[PDB]
Amino acid sequence: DQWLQVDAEVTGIITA
Amino acid sequence: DQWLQVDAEVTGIITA
Amino acid sequence: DQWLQVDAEVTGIITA
Amino acid sequence: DQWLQVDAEVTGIITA
Amino acid sequence: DQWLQVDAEVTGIITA
Amino acid sequence: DQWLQVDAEVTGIITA
Amino acid sequence: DQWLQVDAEVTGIITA
Amino acid sequence: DQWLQVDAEVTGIITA
Amino acid sequence: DQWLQVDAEVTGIITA
Amino acid sequence: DQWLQVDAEVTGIITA
Amino acid sequence: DQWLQVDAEVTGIITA
Amino acid sequence: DQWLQVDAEVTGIITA
Ligand SMILES: [Ca+2]
Ligand SMILES: [Ca+2]
Ligand SMILES: [Ca+2]
Ligand SMILES: [Ca+2]
Numbered sequence: 001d002q003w004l005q006v007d008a009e010v011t012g013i014i015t016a
Numbered sequence: 017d018q019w020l021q022v023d024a025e026v027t028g029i030i031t032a
Numbered sequence: 033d034q035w036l037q038v039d040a041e042v043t044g045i046i047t048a
Numbered sequence: 049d050q051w052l053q054v055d056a057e058v059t060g061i062i063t064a
Numbered sequence: 065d066q067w068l069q070v071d072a073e074v075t076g077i078i079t080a
Numbered sequence: 081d082q083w084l085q086v087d088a089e090v091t092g093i094i095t096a
Numbered sequence: 097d098q099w100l101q102v103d104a105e106v107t108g109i110i111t112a
Numbered sequence: 113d114q115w116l117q118v119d120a121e122v123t124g125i126i127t128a
Numbered sequence: 129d130q131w132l133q134v135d136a137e138v139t140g141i142i143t144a
Numbered sequence: 145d146q147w148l149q150v151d152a153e154v155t156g157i158i159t160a
Numbered sequence: 161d162q163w164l165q166v167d168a169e170v171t172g173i174i175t176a
Numbered sequence: 177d178q179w180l181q182v183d184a185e186v187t188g189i190i191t192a
């Protein structure tokens with residue numbers, strides 16, 4: 001899976 | 017329902 | 033939403 | 049709240 | 065399943 | 081437990 | 097953690 | 113992830 | 129319900 | 145328990 | 161909180 | 177997704 005970091009803005013992404 | 021956008025501060029609200 | 037207070041009897045209600 | 053009956057098609061709605 | 069009604073005392077039971 | 085297959089109609093049941 | 101027994105009144109507390 | 117649309121028949125699939 | 133104890137092997141069962 | 149306030153930065157902590 | 165590691169035997173504990 | 181079989185040791189993995 002991808003995890004999207006949300007703070008709103010998207011501040012990151014992980015990769016699954 | 018109302019959704020309150022929380023960022024902490026409240027940065028929005030939706031209206032249900 | 034309405035919240036119904038349950039104790040059984042209903043002992044209250046909130047109002048959403 | 050509204051409940052939407054989903055079967056896809058929407059086959060109903062309840063009203064809260 | 066059995067459902068036990070809890071109020072604490074047990075005030076009921078359902079029968080599954 | 082019994083599982084009731086819901087599609088609305090009931091289209092099946094499993095038996096627990 | 098503390099568990100508070102709620103019946104409404106608070107009827108107990110456990111201590112975690 | 114793949115999402116399989118279930119209606120029973122499988123009526124779709126999404127791709128993650 | 130039956131609870132099956134899983135450790136993999138099945139190491140027990142409870143019976144509901 | 146301690147609650148850590150996350151905003152990312154840690155912006156607080158509660159104490160349980 | 162304490163976390164108890166369960167494997168059945170208890171094989172550990174963390175401490176909160 | 178990958179599923180990791182945990183028993184502690186990792187005793188397997190599935191792949192999604
Ligand atoms: Ca996934
Ligand atoms: Ca609602
Ligand atoms: Ca922020
Ligand atoms: Ca059951």
Ligand SMILES: [Ca+2]
Pocket residue numbers: 055087119
């Ligand atoms: Ca259908």
Ligand SMILES: [Ca+2]
Pocket residue numbers: 039071103
């Ligand atoms: Ca009572």
Ligand SMILES: [Ca+2]
Pocket residue numbers: 135167183
């Ligand atoms: Ca084991």
Ligand SMILES: [Ca+2]
Pocket residue numbers: 097145161
């Ligand atoms: Ca806790």
